[PDB]
């Protein structure tokens, strides 16, 4: 088959199943953290912190050195299959900080050459876990911190191109809601196919179903 | 057909390869791979100081058989390969890499008897499927097409003692991985990881492949 | 076990006695240091200051020097024992002001 | 002690060495020297070959014995060489190029029984005369000084076959000669004859030294 | 087997160290090195001055046992060591740094009686457990996996006398304990604390491992 032979495949049976990939940049105390794990189904890679607080139920695995962190990505195909095992039920894989990878893989290749080869950790990490998170049927989540998410543009281009669902979450008594409505203040944008529409873009109290559910069932 | 038979005689006895190595003052490695039939050359100096070590004469050190087989393989063979990208850069899977279409030639065995006289078998031998041993390593698996012909070959194979049996299947196999797998890496450019490094030329080389058939059963 | 191996470990154990860091900034005569010490269980670790007279009992260090500093957090451990070996009851430790931790360290470097 | 018997099978059967390196597929040089103990190692497939071919087997091949001796000759020996000069250039006598006044030293020999157990025997070897094989070449001549305190070695020496003997024999012998001579070459300078040329230490070089000795009687 | 017994004698005449050295004019860093039987060379000097001075004979000042031991250590050895990570650098705990899932290996021993004869045993030791000693140190704990089979070579053990057997079993340790650390500090990268500095490599040469056996009881 030559269509097999090349990697040309359809559309339909593709976007039925997929996992879409969700960064959530916001500012500080905004409950970002919370969005990610009220689910109470995630394993959460946070690094040089600890948030699992908020979280009432889950895995946490503290990430110190860029040796540990690259240890847990190779290894991250086996791990899913013991938690599940255990019967913790893993849904999404969580990178609490895109500004810490920046500090750590810097420190493992410590100018413009540093810099691209910093963009070139980062993006060949995104394409190593996409091809496990099509075969363990995994979300995945990174989140940062405001200051659009604060990093250099090699880091933001590659991040924004790459995710499929980029939120901004803000406090409006008071309420949580996250806003993916169109913004020249701010940026964001929500994958959905034509027939889909999405009616309100503002979810209050969001958890990652909801906005899946959004994303693939009518709004 | 010939052998040494120091594998089998230090189980029997129950001597480690280390403590005779330093007792017949031979190293280590040189008596480890005289242990197995790897070795081309034997020099007498072992043979006699073994031989004193273990009070066995020079005869019961090796083991042989007037039979003789030679094994020649076609200089052109036919071979398709079509790559399959599929990123194999970030999983080290051979499959993502390239697949065979259809890999087929021809091994001319000539089996020499005790007397002069020789017989000529032809076997043909064709592609069939890549197993997976293990997670990560394969091994490429050739049937034999023609076995009915020759059903004769066969007669003259298990006559031979169990440990010489062995040694020809090792001698027909190894000549095969390094047949097939010379003629992949050259069709195939080597793609490297992203994540030491394991080119794929490396992970070809090491792919082993092991003829399937009824002539040999072991 | 690979799980062990790494450290990934269960939140619902982790959170259930977890012992929280609390930041208190307060104006003047807020009266920040009696919330600390309230529990009167507490050990101060106050810096070039002493507001001790407004808690009634517990634990209190002087620390005088940033050498003084290096000092009392690497023996906390031995520390804590003690006092709970003499009954006194640790159950928070507490650096009185954020802004003495900077003078003290640029000294250490300047 | 081990030796290959392929000079004396061949000898029995009659067979010629040109035409068995001839069929046997192996090179005539190598066949040679292997029909001497001269090589030191031996291809596993030479062994095959030639026991098919004379329907030996491999027991035939090799003949052994459990005992074992060792040479060590001493690395500070007295040596006394005198100049003769009388124009050895013209005419190639050495004993006019140089005259040995007295070269004595000791060679140190353990007879190692085949349990473990060994006996050590020291020989004490002193410079006799320098014989005159042929005209144009001599053999110098070195007899053992002791030879009463180590008549013990001489029964031991006895006790192996004929074939062995005369191996062990070249042994001692060829090591003796290489060691005297490597010795004077050094304390003599090379004279170039007037009238292809063939100066002092080539000739010293060929020269060869023979011990004489009860111990030792063929 | 040989050691001085000066540190014997010294305590029994109730002479402090520092008064010797004082007297015999002997530094005294030699002298409380000499005192250990670390050193491995003796002045003539040093025997004379202290037999004078102590009115004790040559005799008395060594002692002497014709047995004699020896070990050897595999040159590859099985061992696999995963990191634990879990922050080491702030508290020193090594086994925070790095956990050893399994170290097998096997060290030769031959007890060479007063006459020629020898004996061979064959020691296999595992890896049990990470003792901790004091809260700041450690000391790995292996134990041998066969015992039964080499009974004999307790017996030949004890049969030393009490100083003698303290020396033995001081070497086999300072040796297993060099081998071990040297292995795994090449397999392990350094951490450095926070807050003179102890990096990893270091605490991990400091580290001692000791033998637990039924053979060696003391
Ligand atoms: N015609 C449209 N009407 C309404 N909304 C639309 C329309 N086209 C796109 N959108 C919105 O934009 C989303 C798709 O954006 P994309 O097509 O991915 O944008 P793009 O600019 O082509 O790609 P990048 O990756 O963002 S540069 C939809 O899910 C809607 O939210
Ligand atoms: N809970 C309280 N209820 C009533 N009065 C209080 C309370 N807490 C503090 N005060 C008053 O404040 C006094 C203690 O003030 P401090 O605890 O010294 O203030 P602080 O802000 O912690 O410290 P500084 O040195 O003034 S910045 C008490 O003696 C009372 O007069």
Redesign the interface.
Known sequence: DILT???VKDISKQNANKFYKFAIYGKFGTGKTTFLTKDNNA??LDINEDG??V????????I??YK?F???I??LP??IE??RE?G?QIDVVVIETIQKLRDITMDDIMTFNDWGECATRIV?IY??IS?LQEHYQFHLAISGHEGTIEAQDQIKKAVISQSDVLARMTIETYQYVLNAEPSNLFETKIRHSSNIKINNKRFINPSINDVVQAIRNGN | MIRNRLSELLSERGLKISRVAKDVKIARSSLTSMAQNDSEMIRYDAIDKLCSYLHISPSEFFEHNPINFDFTFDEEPNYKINDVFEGFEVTANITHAFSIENFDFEILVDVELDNRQKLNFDLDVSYKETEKITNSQHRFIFTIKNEDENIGLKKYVDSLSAGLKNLLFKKINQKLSGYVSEIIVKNIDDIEELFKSTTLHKEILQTDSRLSSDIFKE
């Open positions: 032979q090349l990697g394993l959460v699992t607080t979280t009432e139920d889950g895995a946490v695995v503290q110190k050195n540990h690259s240890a847990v190779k290894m086996k791990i013991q938690l255990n913790k060949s394409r190593y091809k």
